[PDB]
Amino acid sequence: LMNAYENTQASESRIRDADMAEETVAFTKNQILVQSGTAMLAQANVRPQGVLSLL
Amino acid sequence: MIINHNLAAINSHRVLKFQNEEVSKNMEKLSSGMRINRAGDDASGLAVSEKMRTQVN
Amino acid sequence: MIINHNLAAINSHRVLKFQNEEVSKNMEKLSSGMRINRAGDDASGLAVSEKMRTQVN
What we know:
The structure is cut from a larger assembly and holds three copies of chain A. By secondary structure, chain A is mainly α. In chain A, 75% of the residues lie in helices and 0% in strands. Chain A: Belongs to the bacterial flagellin family.
């Protein structure tokens, strides 16, 4: 029973428990992309300002 | 440089996973005190060792 | 001054990418802990190393 408990716990951890080192990279990638997207959105917000000179 | 996929991080994590697997194997070998432990490490050795244990008893 | 192209920017980007390649290669090599990690870096070295590993086993 002890051996079976150990093996079953190992399997359950394998198929459910997250690997922190596996998606820490994904999290950092996602926040970097968020920063890039917000920078691009800020840049594109002021884009139509160039037409005001023609008025 | 491409930021959609940190390939260096992927490679480092790939190496780290197998290094941790070997670490766990070594830790279990240390804790049990036996080289064979579960099967697959040396099947022939395990079979012979079981035979010798029966002979000892 | 020509604004259709930025040759200085092009050159800087090229040098930057070809230095990022080297830094990624070095970081992979060092994180793996092995000089000949995965490449055709030293073909003779890799062959001799694999032969020596077989001999050690």
